[PDB]
């Protein structure tokens, strides 16, 4: 028997992303458009900084800029909370600790506006070092990949997730970014509380050679894993 929200992801679905951000008094906006194919756990997006030049490096934003597009293997479908919360949606709140630098606090609403899947994001950044890796623009325009470990928050009828991102620095060193995450549903309708598992995620960054605005092109694969059957 198929689940409520699952039906909605059987095809290619268009995606809109709006982000409003403020890092150490630098304010900026990002808009994104693209598509997502849960069947293959595949996302293609292009992001544009609408306010001009981006005050932080693009890679720092990737995790913040739609885990409902993850491919769940058949035997794991009863563990996909993200799609069980559609089309009403969910709140995705994170804190992101850059080691020896500032933190991002983020709050997003992910839901459907008609046919389109929408990620609306407010981001606040504080205590960054002016000559640090982040505001100093010293990270590589490099892919990022890792596993998102998920667990149930039975009391909040949602989930928690924790993971670490290693951003490459131009000098060969690494900027660690500790992610902490709580997702709760907007609807009153039931949802699927999962058993611990994780989402193997890979994101590939590129550029549109014809594009003059500060922007990022993203291809991304996401697959659930870590339960046995």
GROMACS .gro file of C-alpha atoms in nm:
model
  229
    1UNK     CA    1   0.000   0.000   0.000
    2UNK     CA    2   0.139   0.339  -0.108
    3UNK     CA    3   0.167   0.635   0.132
    4UNK     CA    4  -0.002   0.974   0.108
    5UNK     CA    5   0.297   1.195   0.033
    6UNK     CA    6   0.493   0.937  -0.166
    7UNK     CA    7   0.251   0.956  -0.463
    8UNK     CA    8   0.357   1.314  -0.515
    9UNK     CA    9   0.717   1.220  -0.599
   10UNK     CA   10   0.665   0.956  -0.870
   11UNK     CA   11   0.789   1.191  -1.140
   12UNK     CA   12   1.011   1.490  -1.211
   13UNK     CA   13   0.901   1.780  -0.988
   14UNK     CA   14   1.007   2.144  -1.031
   15UNK     CA   15   1.186   2.317  -0.744
   16UNK     CA   16   1.202   2.675  -0.624
   17UNK     CA   17   1.441   2.797  -0.357
   18UNK     CA   18   1.436   3.135  -0.192
   19UNK     CA   19   1.694   3.234   0.066
   20UNK     CA   20   1.727   3.546   0.268
   21UNK     CA   21   2.055   3.585   0.448
   22UNK     CA   22   2.245   3.808   0.686
   23UNK     CA   23   2.603   3.714   0.780
   24UNK     CA   24   2.785   3.960   1.009
   25UNK     CA   25   2.566   4.243   0.886
   26UNK     CA   26   2.619   4.147   0.518
   27UNK     CA   27   2.277   4.093   0.377
   28UNK     CA   28   2.210   3.895   0.063
   29UNK     CA   29   1.941   3.697  -0.122
   30UNK     CA   30   1.958   3.380  -0.323
   31UNK     CA   31   1.703   3.238  -0.561
   32UNK     CA   32   1.715   2.889  -0.715
   33UNK     CA   33   1.522   2.693  -0.974
   34UNK     CA   34   1.544   2.331  -1.086
   35UNK     CA   35   1.409   1.977  -1.076
   36UNK     CA   36   1.423   1.657  -0.874
   37UNK     CA   37   1.364   1.296  -0.948
   38UNK     CA   38   1.320   1.098  -0.630
   39UNK     CA   39   1.329   0.779  -0.835
   40UNK     CA   40   1.699   0.835  -0.900
   41UNK     CA   41   1.757   1.058  -0.597
   42UNK     CA   42   1.867   1.323  -0.846
   43UNK     CA   43   1.860   1.701  -0.824
   44UNK     CA   44   1.971   1.963  -1.073
   45UNK     CA   45   1.958   2.324  -0.961
   46UNK     CA   46   2.101   2.663  -1.052
   47UNK     CA   47   2.136   2.929  -0.785
   48UNK     CA   48   2.178   3.304  -0.842
   49UNK     CA   49   2.270   3.572  -0.589
   50UNK     CA   50   2.005   3.833  -0.664
   51UNK     CA   51   2.164   4.107  -0.445
   52UNK     CA   52   2.503   4.106  -0.637
   53UNK     CA   53   2.820   3.929  -0.512
   54UNK     CA   54   2.786   3.656  -0.255
   55UNK     CA   55   2.939   3.762   0.085
   56UNK     CA   56   3.018   3.399   0.175
   57UNK     CA   57   3.144   3.110  -0.034
   58UNK     CA   58   2.891   2.911  -0.230
   59UNK     CA   59   2.988   2.574  -0.080
   60UNK     CA   60   2.900   2.698   0.265
   61UNK     CA   61   2.539   2.729   0.148
   62UNK     CA   62   2.490   2.396  -0.026
   63UNK     CA   63   2.348   2.207   0.270
   64UNK     CA   64   2.109   2.485   0.345
   65UNK     CA   65   1.982   2.540  -0.009
   66UNK     CA   66   1.527   1.928  -0.006
   67UNK     CA   67   1.573   1.586   0.141
   68UNK     CA   68   1.224   1.478   0.030
   69UNK     CA   69   1.397   1.406  -0.309
   70UNK     CA   70   1.605   1.124  -0.161
   71UNK     CA   71   1.577   0.782  -0.315
   72UNK     CA   72   1.451   0.539  -0.053
   73UNK     CA   73   1.509   0.172  -0.140
   74UNK     CA   74   1.182  -0.023  -0.146
   75UNK     CA   75   1.249  -0.205   0.181
   76UNK     CA   76   1.302   0.130   0.361
   77UNK     CA   77   0.994   0.323   0.238
   78UNK     CA   78   0.822   0.311   0.582
   79UNK     CA   79   1.117   0.527   0.707
   80UNK     CA   80   1.087   0.830   0.467
   81UNK     CA   81   0.952   1.103   0.698
   82UNK     CA   82   1.026   1.384   0.444
   83UNK     CA   83   0.774   1.265   0.187
   84UNK     CA   84   0.521   1.154   0.455
   85UNK     CA   85   0.496   1.524   0.556
   86UNK     CA   86   0.394   1.639   0.205
   87UNK     CA   87   0.221   1.824   0.062
   88UNK     CA   88   0.158   2.023   0.386
   89UNK     CA   89   0.536   2.025   0.441
   90UNK     CA   90   0.798   2.053   0.715
   91UNK     CA   91   1.018   2.294   0.902
   92UNK     CA   92   1.386   2.235   0.874
   93UNK     CA   93   1.594   2.406   1.138
   94UNK     CA   94   1.971   2.374   1.160
   95UNK     CA   95   2.265   2.517   1.343
   96UNK     CA   96   2.595   2.488   1.159
   97UNK     CA   97   2.916   2.528   1.355
   98UNK     CA   98   3.224   2.621   1.152
   99UNK     CA   99   3.519   2.509   1.365
  100UNK     CA  100   3.722   2.812   1.485
  101UNK     CA  101   3.479   3.052   1.316
  102UNK     CA  102   3.111   3.157   1.326
  103UNK     CA  103   2.784   2.966   1.309
  104UNK     CA  104   2.483   2.964   1.071
  105UNK     CA  105   2.133   2.936   1.222
  106UNK     CA  106   1.877   2.840   0.954
  107UNK     CA  107   1.502   2.797   0.931
  108UNK     CA  108   1.331   2.677   0.620
  109UNK     CA  109   0.985   2.578   0.517
  110UNK     CA  110   0.964   2.306   0.262
  111UNK     CA  111   0.626   2.250   0.103
  112UNK     CA  112   0.428   2.244  -0.220
  113UNK     CA  113   0.290   2.555  -0.383
  114UNK     CA  114   0.075   2.380  -0.636
  115UNK     CA  115   0.289   2.157  -0.849
  116UNK     CA  116   0.610   2.323  -0.742
  117UNK     CA  117   0.820   2.220  -0.442
  118UNK     CA  118   0.935   2.521  -0.248
  119UNK     CA  119   1.223   2.584  -0.003
  120UNK     CA  120   1.202   2.918   0.168
  121UNK     CA  121   1.496   2.999   0.387
  122UNK     CA  122   1.599   3.253   0.644
  123UNK     CA  123   1.962   3.236   0.736
  124UNK     CA  124   2.145   3.422   1.012
  125UNK     CA  125   2.524   3.422   1.050
  126UNK     CA  126   2.719   3.554   1.348
  127UNK     CA  127   3.067   3.567   1.501
  128UNK     CA  128   3.254   3.504   1.177
  129UNK     CA  129   3.617   3.617   1.158
  130UNK     CA  130   3.672   3.887   0.897
  131UNK     CA  131   3.996   3.723   0.780
  132UNK     CA  132   3.869   3.365   0.840
  133UNK     CA  133   3.813   3.093   0.577
  134UNK     CA  134   3.449   3.186   0.531
  135UNK     CA  135   3.443   3.569   0.502
  136UNK     CA  136   3.798   3.557   0.359
  137UNK     CA  137   3.683   3.338   0.066
  138UNK     CA  138   3.956   3.073   0.109
  139UNK     CA  139   3.747   2.753   0.035
  140UNK     CA  140   3.773   2.547  -0.289
  141UNK     CA  141   3.484   2.547  -0.534
  142UNK     CA  142   3.476   2.178  -0.445
  143UNK     CA  143   3.218   1.901  -0.432
  144UNK     CA  144   3.104   1.797  -0.087
  145UNK     CA  145   2.983   1.452   0.016
  146UNK     CA  146   2.892   1.275   0.335
  147UNK     CA  147   2.630   1.083   0.523
  148UNK     CA  148   2.343   1.237   0.713
  149UNK     CA  149   2.262   1.029   1.021
  150UNK     CA  150   1.896   1.035   1.102
  151UNK     CA  151   1.700   0.951   1.413
  152UNK     CA  152   1.347   0.997   1.543
  153UNK     CA  153   1.232   1.272   1.777
  154UNK     CA  154   0.915   1.093   1.909
  155UNK     CA  155   0.834   1.384   2.144
  156UNK     CA  156   0.842   1.643   1.862
  157UNK     CA  157   0.680   1.406   1.609
  158UNK     CA  158   0.979   1.471   1.383
  159UNK     CA  159   1.342   1.382   1.326
  160UNK     CA  160   1.692   1.488   1.422
  161UNK     CA  161   2.003   1.465   1.209
  162UNK     CA  162   2.369   1.524   1.268
  163UNK     CA  163   2.657   1.525   1.029
  164UNK     CA  164   2.997   1.682   0.946
  165UNK     CA  165   3.116   1.848   0.626
  166UNK     CA  166   3.482   1.877   0.538
  167UNK     CA  167   3.527   2.180   0.318
  168UNK     CA  168   3.859   2.184   0.136
  169UNK     CA  169   4.070   2.495   0.180
  170UNK     CA  170   4.290   2.630  -0.104
  171UNK     CA  171   4.605   2.543   0.096
  172UNK     CA  172   4.512   2.176   0.128
  173UNK     CA  173   4.371   2.205   0.481
  174UNK     CA  174   4.008   2.146   0.587
  175UNK     CA  175   3.728   2.362   0.738
  176UNK     CA  176   3.500   2.150   0.944
  177UNK     CA  177   3.129   2.239   0.955
  178UNK     CA  178   2.926   2.061   1.223
  179UNK     CA  179   2.560   2.031   1.128
  180UNK     CA  180   2.278   1.984   1.377
  181UNK     CA  181   1.922   1.948   1.241
  182UNK     CA  182   1.562   1.915   1.363
  183UNK     CA  183   1.270   1.865   1.122
  184UNK     CA  184   0.910   1.895   1.239
  185UNK     CA  185   0.593   1.872   1.028
  186UNK     CA  186   0.365   2.166   0.949
  187UNK     CA  187   0.047   1.961   0.899
  188UNK     CA  188  -0.154   1.790   1.167
  189UNK     CA  189  -0.158   1.468   0.960
  190UNK     CA  190   0.042   1.161   1.069
  191UNK     CA  191   0.391   1.098   0.950
  192UNK     CA  192   0.652   0.824   0.942
  193UNK     CA  193   0.893   0.815   1.235
  194UNK     CA  194   1.202   0.624   1.107
  195UNK     CA  195   1.451   0.384   1.258
  196UNK     CA  196   1.806   0.516   1.252
  197UNK     CA  197   1.948   0.528   0.906
  198UNK     CA  198   2.137   0.771   0.688
  199UNK     CA  199   2.137   0.954   0.356
  200UNK     CA  200   2.442   0.921   0.145
  201UNK     CA  201   2.474   1.251  -0.035
  202UNK     CA  202   2.699   1.382  -0.309
  203UNK     CA  203   2.690   1.733  -0.455
  204UNK     CA  204   2.890   1.845  -0.761
  205UNK     CA  205   2.951   2.213  -0.814
  206UNK     CA  206   2.998   2.384  -1.148
  207UNK     CA  207   2.946   2.707  -1.340
  208UNK     CA  208   2.746   2.825  -1.637
  209UNK     CA  209   3.002   2.978  -1.867
  210UNK     CA  210   2.741   3.216  -2.018
  211UNK     CA  211   2.625   3.350  -1.683
  212UNK     CA  212   2.755   3.684  -1.551
  213UNK     CA  213   2.575   3.694  -1.220
  214UNK     CA  214   2.740   3.528  -0.919
  215UNK     CA  215   2.583   3.182  -0.930
  216UNK     CA  216   2.624   2.809  -0.868
  217UNK     CA  217   2.511   2.507  -1.074
  218UNK     CA  218   2.450   2.197  -0.865
  219UNK     CA  219   2.402   1.830  -0.952
  220UNK     CA  220   2.321   1.617  -0.656
  221UNK     CA  221   2.255   1.251  -0.567
  222UNK     CA  222   2.091   1.138  -0.246
  223UNK     CA  223   2.018   0.779  -0.146
  224UNK     CA  224   1.889   0.645   0.181
  225UNK     CA  225   2.080   0.351   0.338
  226UNK     CA  226   2.187   0.158   0.649
  227UNK     CA  227   1.899  -0.082   0.729
  228UNK     CA  228   1.915  -0.451   0.637
  229UNK     CA  229   1.682  -0.643   0.401
   0.00000   0.00000   0.00000
